[PDB]
Design an enzyme around this catalytic site. Structure first.
Site, PDB file in Angstrom:
ATOM      1  N   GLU A 118       0.872  -1.190   0.000  1.00 42.26           N
ATOM      2  CA  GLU A 118       0.000   0.000   0.000  1.00 42.26           C
ATOM      3  C   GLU A 118       0.894   1.220   0.000  1.00 42.26           C
ATOM      4  O   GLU A 118       1.924   1.228   0.667  1.00 42.26           O
ATOM      5  CB  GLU A 118      -0.915  -0.036   1.240  1.00 42.26           C
ATOM      6  CG  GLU A 118      -1.768  -1.346   1.267  1.00 42.26           C
ATOM      7  CD  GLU A 118      -2.546  -1.564   2.552  1.00 42.26           C
ATOM      8  OE1 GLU A 118      -2.149  -1.022   3.609  1.00 42.26           O
ATOM      9  OE2 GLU A 118      -3.565  -2.328   2.503  1.00 42.26           O
ATOM     10  N   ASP A 134      -4.848  -8.271   6.043  1.00 39.14           N
ATOM     11  CA  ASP A 134      -5.834  -9.174   5.432  1.00 39.14           C
ATOM     12  C   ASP A 134      -5.345 -10.626   5.352  1.00 39.14           C
ATOM     13  O   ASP A 134      -6.132 -11.567   5.486  1.00 39.14           O
ATOM     14  CB  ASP A 134      -6.219  -8.676   4.032  1.00 39.14           C
ATOM     15  CG  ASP A 134      -7.033  -7.370   4.058  1.00 39.14           C
ATOM     16  OD1 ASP A 134      -7.544  -6.964   5.115  1.00 39.14           O
ATOM     17  OD2 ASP A 134      -7.223  -6.793   2.983  1.00 39.14           O
TER      18      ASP A 134
HETATM   19  O1  LIG Z   1     -10.026  -1.096  11.653  1.00 34.67           O
HETATM   20  C1  LIG Z   1      -9.360  -0.724  10.475  1.00 34.67           C
HETATM   21  C2  LIG Z   1      -9.071   0.774  10.501  1.00 34.67           C
HETATM   22  O2  LIG Z   1      -7.887   1.000   9.707  1.00 34.67           O
HETATM   23  C3  LIG Z   1      -8.139   0.692   8.338  1.00 34.67           C
HETATM   24  O3  LIG Z   1      -7.021   0.359   7.488  1.00 34.67           O
HETATM   25  C4  LIG Z   1      -5.674   0.688   7.812  1.00 34.67           C
HETATM   26  C5  LIG Z   1      -5.311   1.780   6.810  1.00 34.67           C
HETATM   27  O4  LIG Z   1      -5.626   3.090   7.318  1.00 34.67           O
HETATM   28  C6  LIG Z   1      -3.885   1.754   6.332  1.00 34.67           C
HETATM   29  O5  LIG Z   1      -3.495   2.896   5.563  1.00 34.67           O
HETATM   30  C7  LIG Z   1      -2.156   3.303   5.624  1.00 34.67           C
HETATM   31  C8  LIG Z   1      -2.209   4.716   6.201  1.00 34.67           C
HETATM   32  O6  LIG Z   1      -2.291   4.634   7.636  1.00 34.67           O
HETATM   33  C9  LIG Z   1      -1.058   5.646   5.760  1.00 34.67           C
HETATM   34  O7  LIG Z   1      -1.548   6.960   5.864  1.00 34.67           O
HETATM   35  C10 LIG Z   1      -0.556   7.971   5.844  1.00 34.67           C
HETATM   36  C11 LIG Z   1      -0.712   8.707   7.164  1.00 34.67           C
HETATM   37  O8  LIG Z   1       0.124   8.052   8.151  1.00 34.67           O
HETATM   38  C12 LIG Z   1      -0.548  10.260   7.119  1.00 34.67           C
HETATM   39  O9  LIG Z   1       0.228  10.736   8.228  1.00 34.67           O
HETATM   40  O10 LIG Z   1      -0.087  10.890   5.891  1.00 34.67           O
HETATM   41  C13 LIG Z   1       0.015  10.114   4.679  1.00 34.67           C
HETATM   42  C14 LIG Z   1      -0.319  10.993   3.476  1.00 34.67           C
HETATM   43  O11 LIG Z   1      -1.586  11.629   3.682  1.00 34.67           O
HETATM   44  C15 LIG Z   1      -0.859   8.875   4.670  1.00 34.67           C
HETATM   45  O12 LIG Z   1      -0.594   8.147   3.472  1.00 34.67           O
HETATM   46  O13 LIG Z   1      -0.735   5.476   4.378  1.00 34.67           O
HETATM   47  C16 LIG Z   1      -0.404   4.127   4.078  1.00 34.67           C
HETATM   48  C17 LIG Z   1       0.195   4.083   2.703  1.00 34.67           C
HETATM   49  O14 LIG Z   1       1.386   3.307   2.837  1.00 34.67           O
HETATM   50  C18 LIG Z   1      -1.681   3.322   4.171  1.00 34.67           C
HETATM   51  O15 LIG Z   1      -1.509   1.978   3.701  1.00 34.67           O
HETATM   52  O16 LIG Z   1      -2.988   0.599   6.434  1.00 34.67           O
HETATM   53  C19 LIG Z   1      -3.342  -0.330   7.462  1.00 34.67           C
HETATM   54  C20 LIG Z   1      -2.570  -1.629   7.206  1.00 34.67           C
HETATM   55  O17 LIG Z   1      -2.799  -2.118   5.871  1.00 34.67           O
HETATM   56  C21 LIG Z   1      -4.855  -0.573   7.472  1.00 34.67           C
HETATM   57  O18 LIG Z   1      -5.162  -1.623   8.382  1.00 34.67           O
HETATM   58  C22 LIG Z   1      -9.176   1.623   7.674  1.00 34.67           C
HETATM   59  O19 LIG Z   1      -8.595   2.550   6.744  1.00 34.67           O
HETATM   60  C23 LIG Z   1     -10.020   2.371   8.698  1.00 34.67           C
HETATM   61  O20 LIG Z   1     -11.272   2.682   8.067  1.00 34.67           O
HETATM   62  C24 LIG Z   1     -10.310   1.514   9.942  1.00 34.67           C
HETATM   63  O21 LIG Z   1     -10.942   2.324  10.960  1.00 34.67           O
END
Ligand SMILES: OC[C@H]1O[C@H](O[C@@H]2[C@@H](O)[C@H](O[C@@H]3[C@@H](O)[C@H](O[C@@H]4[C@@H](O)[C@@H](O)O[C@H](CO)[C@H]4O)O[C@H](CO)[C@H]3O)O[C@H](CO)[C@H]2O)[C@H](O)[C@@H](O)[C@@H]1O
Length: 362
Positions: A118, A134
């Protein structure tokens, strides 16, 4: 941050199959869903349906064994999928792409050996992760080349770590063995995470009830203190169980959120009775506390270190096992493994390159 950065994809799998790569997500500038080709050019999905209809073939040829290939990643938030031998089948709903759901015996991709990483690339930089939320399947490492030239990577298993995880899952009594999806010739394909284990009936809704009852007992007589903002340590919420409900009060004395006793799906999926939409940050902390089984032992949450994680005889064994087999000890074993910064994510504000390495099945 430039319009695109190079993603180097390296095939160290030791496998003979051709690799298909898919870069699927949402384009930053337009907010449209679609796919990007090797040049980084964006192609919006055609209109989907209810019921969902077939997506066009968005595959990019991946690297041959022992070689690498480079694709350009545009400003985009999505997944890089890779599959071995067989192409993936994606479908399109009214609202866009349907994600695979291989907990379903009838999913078109059930028998395909694949995984995904991701990522988000935007004006603020790159985030890229290895995830097991997953499933646990074809192994891979992700990396970023930072603005200063230094590299960060994560997701890499220890030697023997791939088979080690399956072997440890199979030997865990209670239903964890039924998380494993195994080929006819006995070849393992993947293990589902325990959320999907509850959905498939591999694990019962009640698997954590005894621990949860012990937590709710403990915090009937003593406070559970949650400090859910890492940069604001003075912001605290105080939890106490009364009338069977865990109620959190803020510094002002207001009850700000309440929790009913959670079940297995709620814990393993970090959702339902543990939904995380001020509730969100608190729920996040509690979720990690239940999955790591630290709530009983440590009334000041979140934990300051990983030393006491996964010590209870019933715990998130899938997460325990995966962390134990990861070279850097980090993983995304459940949705809020980022609590206490134990998740396999790397980021930089001024990237200039990324990497995805297809790892051996060791
Ligand atoms: O109960 C489930 C709960 O989480 C769900 O899925 C998470 C999902 O959020 C996730 O996404 C990763 C992000 O956390 C990450 O986001 C970054 C942030 O940290 C932020 O600070 O800035 C940047 C830019 O805006 C964001 O990109 O980004 C990564 C990309 O690498 C995402 O993958 O990953 C985890 C593990 O796979 C999931 O479990 C869901 O989204 C929610 O709805 C639920 O409440």
């Amino acid at each position: 941050v430039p319009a695109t950065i190079p993603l180097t994809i390296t095939n160290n799998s030791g496998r003979a199959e051709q690799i298909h790569i898919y870069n699927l997500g949402t384009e930053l500038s337009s907010g449209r869903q679609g796919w990007a080709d090797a040049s980084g050019a964006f192609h919006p999905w055609p209109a989907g349906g209810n019921p969902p209809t077939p997506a066009p073939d968005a595959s990019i040829p991946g690297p041959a064994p022992g070689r690498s290939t480079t694709i350009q990643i545009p400003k985009f938030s999505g997944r890089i999928y890779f599959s071995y031998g067989r192409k993936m089948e994606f479908r399109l709903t009214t609202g866009g792409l349907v994600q695979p759901a291989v907990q379903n015996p009838t999913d078109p991709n059930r028998d395909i050996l694949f995984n995904w990483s991701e990522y988000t690339l935007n004006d603020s930089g790159l985030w890229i992760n290895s995830t097991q939320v997953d499933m646990f399947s074809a192994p891979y490492t992700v990396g970023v080349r930072r603005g200063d030239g230094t590299t960060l990577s994560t997701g890499k298993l220890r030697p023997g770590g791939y088979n080690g995880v399956f072997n440890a899952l199979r030997g865990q009594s209670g239903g964890w063995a039924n998380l494993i999806q195994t080929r006819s010739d006995g070849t393992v394909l993947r293990a589902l995470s325990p959320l999907y284990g509850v959905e498939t009936g591999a694990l019962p809704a009640s698997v954590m009830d005894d621990y949860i009852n012990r937590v709710w007992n403990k915090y009937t007589g003593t406070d559970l203190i949650v400090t859910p903002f890492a940069d604001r340590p003075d912001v605290r919420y105080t939890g106490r169980v009364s009338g069977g409900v865990l109620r959190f009060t803020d510094g002002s004395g207001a009850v700000v959120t309440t929790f009913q006793k959670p079940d297995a799906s709620s814990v393993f999926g970090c959702h339902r009775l543990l939904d995380a939409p001020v509730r969100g940050p608190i729920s996040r902390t509690l979720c990690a506390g239940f999955n790591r089984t630290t709530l009983l032992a440590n009334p000041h949450q979140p934990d300051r270190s990983a030393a006491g994680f996964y010590q209870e005889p019933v715990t998130n064994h899938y997460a325990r096992i995966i962390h134990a087999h990861m070279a850097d000890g980090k993983a995304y074993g459940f949705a809020f493994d980022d609590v206490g910064h134990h998740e396999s994510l790397v980021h930089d504000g001024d990237p200039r390159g990324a990497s995805l390495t297809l790892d051996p099945f060791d």
